[PDB]
Amino acid sequence: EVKLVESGGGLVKPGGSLKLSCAASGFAFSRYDMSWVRQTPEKRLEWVATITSGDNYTYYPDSVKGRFTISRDNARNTLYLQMSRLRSEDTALYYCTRQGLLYYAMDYWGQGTSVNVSSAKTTPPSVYPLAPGCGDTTGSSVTLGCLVKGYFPESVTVTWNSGSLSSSVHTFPALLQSGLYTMSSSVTVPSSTWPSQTVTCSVAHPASSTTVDKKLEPS
Amino acid sequence: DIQMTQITSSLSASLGDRVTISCSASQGINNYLSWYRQKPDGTVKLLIYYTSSLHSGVPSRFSGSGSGTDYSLTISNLEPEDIATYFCQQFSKLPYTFGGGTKLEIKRADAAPTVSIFPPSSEQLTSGGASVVCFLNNFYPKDINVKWKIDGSERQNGVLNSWTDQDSKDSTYSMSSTLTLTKDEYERHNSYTCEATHKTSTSPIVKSFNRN
């Protein structure tokens, strides 16, 4: 295999610095043009840097000129991307890649080291239970849930009844509102078996070292 | 800069089908296009280079084509390893630009959403906030629309909508509509309604509650 391990990715405060690394293995690294590409949270791909294998030049796009500084070390078989004066926009997943040879597309890409970039400090989640209020429509199935407000960094993993009622469950992607993350999770069960049975949502957020259980009480 | 336009954000195709996935370019590239595939989780891997030459270790069903500004990747007899996003790059000149990406999802017989509405919990009202939540679960296709109505007149102000990936289990999408409100102005109104327009019926499906 041609392999590209990447590292150095992490959380950084706006206007900060960080140095990404990309370890190469499975080819003559010195005789290959190397590049960096990033995937925005939005999702899209974005070219970031390239460097000529005849040691020569570096090429960047307008969006990051002068701030970013690609560089290699053929001795180590390692490619660095020296970032500085980071921004909100630079929040993305950064892949190192291999151009080259006959047709100059990126033929091999690494796993991808991540670069979350924000000013927010770690915060455990508020957890609020979601149960149907008042109107007794009941019906033959019933859906419940758990709202998880005001947390950071995104990483929360909501599970139900120790994954007992795990089919008929929908965990939604976390949107970012007011500098902090917000997500929810719904779960559906037979109408009969709820009010009687214990139904607990367990919200683990290992970033803040927390786990918040919550039983769902009727109304 | 070359604007690389991949027109279909996502597209529906039943397993074992033939799929065409188009990528148009702002200016003439000299069939110096590429194709990439990104497994929902995994790395991305080079599929086609030039315009049609396949990378090593790529199945035979993948075949690229095109000339000038228009290009296509095409996959005969689709296999479930191919449910993924696909990207076209060009490398004719700097700066290297990619496509928007085309997500590949599996067609099922469109089903309507089971809509549930929830008032903000007492635990949160103590905190001094009020989030009205509306789940719209197990439907198809992804194309869905939501109206929030306080006392009969709509509001698009504190809304936030989060959609799921296509359920690996049963090929149905589900979404979550959160109406974040200041807890005082939550109590200045009584009727909270959450409408949902979908392909499966003409007039919308409505779930609501009052404060009493």
Add this chain to the structure above:
Amino acid sequence: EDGDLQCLCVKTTSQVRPRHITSLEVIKAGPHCPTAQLIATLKNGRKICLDLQAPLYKKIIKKLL
């Protein structure tokens, strides 16, 4: 189309007498020429571009790369 720089070898031939070729330069793919090329330089002095689609190509991939 605002003409950027181009490849030296935009078009090629497989058709040439190897008896004529005194030398052979190969250059990689680059940002200023997407396809790689190779330049056969003849006895009389001309240089020519030879096809990488033909099996003159398996002596490239290995050769430089």
